Amino acid sequence: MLSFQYPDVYRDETAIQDYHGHKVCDPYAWLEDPDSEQTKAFVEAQNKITVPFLEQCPIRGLYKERMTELYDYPKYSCHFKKGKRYFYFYNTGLQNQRVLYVQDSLEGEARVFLDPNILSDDGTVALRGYAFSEDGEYFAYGLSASGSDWVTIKFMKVDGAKELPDVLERVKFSCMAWTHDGKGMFYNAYPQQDGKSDGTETSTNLHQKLYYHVLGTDQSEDILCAEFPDEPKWMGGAELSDDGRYVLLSIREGCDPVNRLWYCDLQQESNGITGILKWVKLIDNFEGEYDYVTNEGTVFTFKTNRHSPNYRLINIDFTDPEESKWKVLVPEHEKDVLEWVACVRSNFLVLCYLHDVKNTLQLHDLATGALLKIFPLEVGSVVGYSGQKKDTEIFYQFTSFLSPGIIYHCDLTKEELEPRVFREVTVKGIDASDYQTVQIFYPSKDGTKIPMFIVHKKGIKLDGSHPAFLYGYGGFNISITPNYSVSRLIFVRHMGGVLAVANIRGGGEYGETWHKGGILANKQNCFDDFQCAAEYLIKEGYTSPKRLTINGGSNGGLLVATCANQRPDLFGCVIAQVGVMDMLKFHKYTIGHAWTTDYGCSDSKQHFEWLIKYSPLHNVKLPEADDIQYPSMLLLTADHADRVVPLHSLKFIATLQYIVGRSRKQNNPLLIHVDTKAGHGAGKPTAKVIEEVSDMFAFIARCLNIDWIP
Numbered sequence: 243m244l245s246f247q248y249p250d251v252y253r254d255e256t257a258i259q260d261y262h263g264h265k266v267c268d269p270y271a272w273l274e275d276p277d278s279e280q281t282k283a284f285v286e287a288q289n290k291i292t293v294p295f296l297e298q299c300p301i302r303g304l305y306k307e308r309m310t311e312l313y314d315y316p317k318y319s320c321h322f323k324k325g326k327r328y329f330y331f332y333n334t335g336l337q338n339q340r341v342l343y344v345q346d347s348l349e350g351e352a353r354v355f356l357d358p359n360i361l362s363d364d365g366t367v368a369l370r371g372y373a374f375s376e377d378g379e380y381f382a383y384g385l386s387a388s389g390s391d392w393v394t395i396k397f398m399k400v401d402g403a404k405e406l407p408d409v410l411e412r413v414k415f416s417c418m419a420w421t422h423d424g425k426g427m428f429y430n431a432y433p434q435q436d437g438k439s440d441g442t443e444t445s446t447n448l449h450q451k452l453y454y455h456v457l458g459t460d461q462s463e464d465i466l467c468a469e470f471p472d473e474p475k476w477m478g479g480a481e482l483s484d485d486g487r488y489v490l491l492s493i494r495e496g497c498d499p500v501n502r503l504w505y506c507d508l509q510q511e512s513n514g515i516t517g518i519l520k521w522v523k524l525i526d527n528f529e530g531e532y533d534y535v536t537n538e539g540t541v542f543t544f545k546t547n548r549h550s551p552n553y554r555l556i557n558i559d560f561t562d563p564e565e566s567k568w569k570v571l572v573p574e575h576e577k578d579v580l581e582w583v584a585c586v587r588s589n590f591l592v593l594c595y596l597h598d599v600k601n602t603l604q605l606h607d608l609a610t611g612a613l614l615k616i617f618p619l620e621v622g623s624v625v626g627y628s629g630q631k632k633d634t635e636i637f638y639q640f641t642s643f644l645s646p647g648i649i650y651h652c653d654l655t656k657e658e659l660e661p662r663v664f665r666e667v668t669v670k671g672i673d674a675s676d677y678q679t680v681q682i683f684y685p686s687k688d689g690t691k692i693p694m695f696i697v698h699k700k701g702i703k704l705d706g707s708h709p710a711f712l713y714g715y716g717g718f719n720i721s722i723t724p725n726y727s728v729s730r731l732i733f734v735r736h737m738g739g740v741l742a743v744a745n746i747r748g749g750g751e752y753g754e755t756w757h758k759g760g761i762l763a764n765k766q767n768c769f770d771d772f773q774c775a776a777e778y779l780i781k782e783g784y785t786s787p788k789r790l791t792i793n794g795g796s797n798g799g800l801l802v803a804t805c806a807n808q809r810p811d812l813f814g815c816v817i818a819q820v821g822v823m824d825m826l827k828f829h830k831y832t833i834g835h836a837w838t839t840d841y842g843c844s845d846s847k848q849h850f851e852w853l854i855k856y857s858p859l860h861n862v863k864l865p866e867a868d869d870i871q872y873p874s875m876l877l878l879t880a881d882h883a884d885r886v887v888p889l890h891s892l893k894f895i896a897t898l899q900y901i902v903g904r905s906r907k908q909n910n911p912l913l914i915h916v917d918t919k920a921g922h923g924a925g926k927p928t929a930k931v932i933e934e935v936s937d938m939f940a941f942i943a944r945c946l947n948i949d950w951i952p
């Protein structure tokens with residue numbers, strides 16, 4: 243099958259660094275420079291072989307055509323009210339970017355409010371964050387170009403959708419919060435740095451500050467409200483309390499679900515927002531999470547994990563702040579994780595729980611925390627919600643593996659709440675009734691039972707002859723819940739595959755204990771859990787090693803790259819998207835410093851010892867057995883992928899091609915594809931999404947020789 247030659251890549255054999263006594267060679271360290279002629283040549287050379295390999299099989303065109311047909315279904319966001327108008331996002335089907343619409347009433351004629359498609363020919367300019375003024379008459383929105391995390395904030399007057407001249411630059415990982423007087427808005431920005439700031443640079447992001455922009459002024463006049471000169475890594479996001487009296491500052495350092503919480507009573511400012519605010523340091527440590535829900539006077543309701551791994555709701559009275567005085571409003575559940583909470587219709591709380599990786603939604607009384615109503619839902623996830631404290635109705639969107647989903651609506655002014663279907667779309671061509679989703683629990687190496695969802699065609703024989711696609715993330719307290727993917731269903735219907743999603747440790751499926759069970763010294767638990775998922779699928783007859791493909795992106799990219807190194811015998815194909823591969827230097831680039839809470843940092847001897855054992859870049863080794871080679875591998879990244887810089891993938895593929903690719907027994911391809919005008923993934927235009935999934939499934943089809951089923 244292999245009919246190409248890997249490109250020549252210079253090895254700097256002098257690049258040696260000592261890590262606590264352990265010498266480490268990094269011969270491809272020069273790929274860390276994105277703008278060098280050497281790196282640019284490397285990328286061109288790699289793409290030169292990858293593209294023809296992916297496009298040789300007619301299967302790619304068949305998949306692409308099918309994906310284009312099936313993905314063409316109306317896509318709506320929940321309606322949300324702001325001021326006197328309703329807004330919602332809607333994509334007719336194949337538009338590159340969804341459009342924001344506005345209407346005067348739920349039964350009124352809708353009109354376009356903001357169409358990002360006219361901002362670029364290829365749909366590479368996308369909305370990234372937005373905030374309406376309290377009265378709903380002004381609108382702030384962020385725009386990101388080419389997939390970069392960098393944002394430029396723009397403004398509009400809602401009535402007439404008039405563009406305003408206000409423009410804010412250097413915005414990244416920013417809050418957006420208008421003061422209720424409608425005078426200005428809080429946002430975050432970074433200091434000037436040498437080089438570029440378009441997503442192609444690798445420069446670390448430090449010293450983020452909180453500013454206040456007065457509408458109608460130039461950004462140069464913005465007020466600095468908070469900064470942390472002695473703590474370069476801290477990031478403070480502002481939000482206004484529902485009554486607009488307080489500014490709450492949530493300060494974070496890293497990715498752990500914890501934050502300091504300071505507040506500023508705006509009424510106590512000597513003369514408005516003129517400089518650093520009179521911050522009151524309510525919670526001045528990083529011991530727990532405090533997510534504002536609402537407040538009634540000085541009594542603030544927060545969702546927290548303080549002494550509660552599955553989360554709970556507590557009330558802190560600012561006038562009697564000591565912990566011994568806090569009141570528990572809704573106690574922690576023994577197993578179900580409280581994911582999020584919203585306050586609506588003045589005194590109702592909407593609580594969303596995760597029960598065995600499926601969402602449940604319920605209404606509670608704010609005063610007592612008592613359960614009032616359970617909103618019926620099928621097995622799946624809640625992926626959209628609308629309903630503020632001044633609102634008198636809620637909208638929520640549900641999705642699952644087999645259906646795009648439904649948006650429900652509930653008028654909360656009615657004595658007997660009756661949720662009703664507001665919007666429901668069906669995908670013609672895919673009969674959900676022909677497939678099934680099951681949830682099993684498999685034991686890992688240490689005996690821990692791990693959940694896994696498996697989706698397949700009803701009635702298949704578990705003889706191990708089916709191609710399988712196993713997905714995992716495993717980290718950062720992220721829960722991987724059911725979601726609708728037409729791309730994966732085409733693999734099931736047209737390639738005869740089985741889909742599996744493993745809820746390994748490191749995620750937040752079972753609260754903080756689940757997260758802590760897969761980080762730092764225990765990161766290897768993630769990998770063991772994922773490898774055990776693969777073993778289960780094989781033992782149970784869903785697939786065989788040669789027909790199994792594993793996929794993950796970002797921390798999930800690290801996941802699959804590590805599994806390829808540790809158990810190359812268990813997989814036939816590996817697809818890693820925007821993955822972290824150099825665990826020794828990840829903290830040196832862009833926002834990488836934030837991930838040390840999950841991984842540790844090589845600067846520490848103890849941490850280095852954990853990292854070196856699994857860092858993909860440092861564990862590529864020819865399999866000992868003559869009959870075992872590495873699985874076919876495809877790494878995907880992009881020029882503006884500034885969350886997890888491309889250098890990780892570039893150095894990893896160079897190493898794979900040299901160490902493994904040069905061996906006589908290696909016949910499976912080891913390829914990388916670097917896309918242009920794209921980033922980490924958020925905001926990717928539909929056209930690119932279709933191309934990407936088409937590449938992925940074409941790779942799988944070619945490497946495993948899978949026949950298309952019309």
Ligand code: PRO
Nearest residue numbers: 795796797798837886
């Ligand atoms: O999406 C991700 O996984 C990146 C890398 C780890 C933390 N955030």
